[PDB]
C-alpha cells in the first residue's frame, strides 16, 4: 500500500533515502497487534483513531488527555493518517498529569499494569509499549521497564532531549528495552536528541505532524515523537510475522538504514528505523 503526501517521518521509515513524501507499507498495517501508549492519555474519540483507541487506566482524577502529548504519540503509532500501524489497537495508560508530569512511582505502576493488563486484551500478533517520557537515572524505573519487556512486550522508550548521554536518564538507560533517538528530515541527528551506547535506533523526531486534543493536529518535536515511530514499526512487523516482542528491537536494528545520519557521536549507533517494505 501507498499513502501519498504522508508526514515526512512515515515516508522516511519506508525509504532508503530522505526527501520523499509517500509512505509504503503492507496493508495488514499492524492488525491483530496492540500498542500501549503510557503517557498523558489519548483522546480516543478523535476521528483519526476510528474506534481503535481506548483508555484502559489512569492514576489521576480523569483518564482524559488534557495535554495533547499522549494523543500525538498515539497518533504516530496508529492514527489512520499520521500513524505507522494504521490498523493496530491502541491502549492508553495515563501516568502523566495534564502538565506532562508524573512521579516515578506512578510510572512504575503503569509499566507493571501493562505487563498484567495485556492478559486482558486480544493481541494475537503481539504487544508493544511506547514510553515517550523520562527523567534522571533510577534503577527502580529501569527495572520496571525491564520487567515489562521480560513479560513479552516490545518496550520502546525515548532517549531524552538534553543533547546528552542517555545513560543518565531512565527508562532510556535500561539496556533490555529499545531506546530511541531522534532525527530530522535531512537525516541529521535532531539537535536536542540524547545519544550514547545505550541507544538502539533513531526515528523521525523533528517536526512530526500527528493528532492533538480537540480533534486537531499539530507538528511538534522530540525523542517523544521518534519513539512511537519505532513502536508502531514493531507492531507492524509483528503482524507480518517477521519478529516478536523479545526480538523486535534487534530486528529493527538489523534491518535499519545504516550510516545515513549526520552528527552521530562516535560510539552511538548510526541506525535509522526502516520497514524494508517492497511493494
CB atoms within 10 A of CB 278: 6
From residue 152 to residue 171, the character string flagging contacts with ligand 479 as x (rule: CB under 6 A) and all else as - is --------------------
39, 65, 97, 184: the catalytic one is: 39
Provide, rounded to whole angstroms, the least separation between the CB of residue 130 and ligand 479: 12
In angstroms, rounded to a whole number, what is the distance separating the alpha carbons of residues 181 and 273? 10
Q: With binding defined as CB under 6 A, does residue 135 bind ligand 479?
A: yes
Do 128 and 35 touch, CB atoms closer than 8 A? Answer: yes
Name the 3-class secondary structure at 169.
strand
Q: With binding defined as CB under 6 A, does residue 133 bind ligand 479?
A: yes
Nearer to ligand 479, 166 or 240 (CB): 166
Q: What's 264's DSSP letter?
A: P
Exactly one of 102, 196, 204, 228 binds ligand 479 (CB under 6 A); that residue is: 102
Compute the residue count for the chain: 279
Provide, rounded to whole angstroms, the least separation between the CB of residue 159 and ligand 479: 12
Name the 3-class secondary structure at 131.
strand
In angstroms, rounded to a whole number, what is the distance separating the alpha carbons of residues 189 and 123? 34
39 flagged as catalytic:
yes
In angstroms, rounded to a whole number, what is the distance separating the alpha carbons of residues 217 and 157? 23
Q: Which stretch binds ligand 479 (CB under 6 A): 81-89, 97-105, 199-207, 258-266?
A: 97-105
Beta pairing, strands 89-94 & 33-39 = parallel
187 flagged as catalytic:
no
Nearer to ligand 479, 107 or 238 (CB): 107
In angstroms, rounded to a whole number, what is the distance separating the alpha carbons of residues 86 and 143? 31
Name the 3-class secondary structure at 97.
coil
Q: Which stretch binds ligand 479 (CB under 6 A): 83-91, 131-139, 191-199, 259-267?
A: 131-139
Query: Is 260 flagged in the annotation as binding?
Result: yes
Would you tell me which residues interact with ligand 479 (CB under 6 A)?
A: 69, 100-102, 104, 107, 133-136, 224
**Positions at the binding site for Ca(2+):** 16, 175, 177, 200, 260
- Enumerate the active-site residues: 39, 69, 224
Amino acid at each position: 500500500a501507498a499513502q501519498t503526501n504522508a508526514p515526512w517521518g512515515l515516508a522516511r521509515i519506508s525509504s532508503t533515502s530522505p526527501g520523499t513524501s509517500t509512505y509504503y507499507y503492507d496493508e495488514s498495517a499492524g492488525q491483530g497487534s496492540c500498542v500501549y501508549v503510557i503517557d498523558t492519555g489519548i483522546e480516543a474519540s478523535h476521528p483519526e483513531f476510528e474506534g481503535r483507541a481506548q483508555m484502559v487506566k489512569t492514576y489521576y482524577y480523569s483518564s482524559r488527555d488534557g495535554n495533547g502529548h499522549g494523543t500525538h504519540c498515539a497518533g504516530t503509532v496508529g492514527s489512520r493518517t499520521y500513524g505507522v500501524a494504521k490498523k493496530t489497537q491502541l491502549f492508553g495508560v495515563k501516568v502523566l498529569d495534564d502538565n506532562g508530569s508524573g512521579q516515578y512511582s506512578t510510572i512504575i505502576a503503569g509499566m507493571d499494569f501493562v505487563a498484567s493488563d495485556k492478559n486482558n486484551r486480544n493481541c494475537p500478533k503481539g504487544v508493544v509499549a511506547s514510553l515517550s517520557l523520562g527523567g534522571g537515572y533510577s534503577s527502580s524505573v529501569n527495572s520496571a521497564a525491564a520487567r515489562l519487556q521480560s513479560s513479552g512486550v516490545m518496550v520502546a522508550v525515548a532517549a531524552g532531549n538534553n543533547n546528552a548521554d542517555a545513560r543518565n536518564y531512565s527508562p532510556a538507560s535500561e539496556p533490555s528495552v529499545c531506546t530511541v533517538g531522534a532525527s530530522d528530515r535531512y537525516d541529521r541527528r535532531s539537535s536536542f536528541s540524547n545519544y550514547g551506547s545505550v541507544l538502539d535506533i533513531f526515528g523521525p523526531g523533528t517536526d512530526i505532524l500527528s493528532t492533538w486534543i480537540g480533534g486537531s493536529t499539530r507538528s511538534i518535536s522530540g525523542t517523544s515523537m521518534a519513539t512511537p515511530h519505532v513502536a508502531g514499526l514493531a507492531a507492524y512487523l509483528m503482524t507480518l510475522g517477521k519478529t516478536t516482542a523479545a526480538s523486535a528491537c534487534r530486528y529493527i536494528a538489523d534491518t535499519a538504514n545504516k550510516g545515513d545520519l549526520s552528527n552521530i557521536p562516535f560510539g552511538t549507533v548510526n541506525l535509522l528505523a526502516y520497514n524494508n517494505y517492497q511493494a
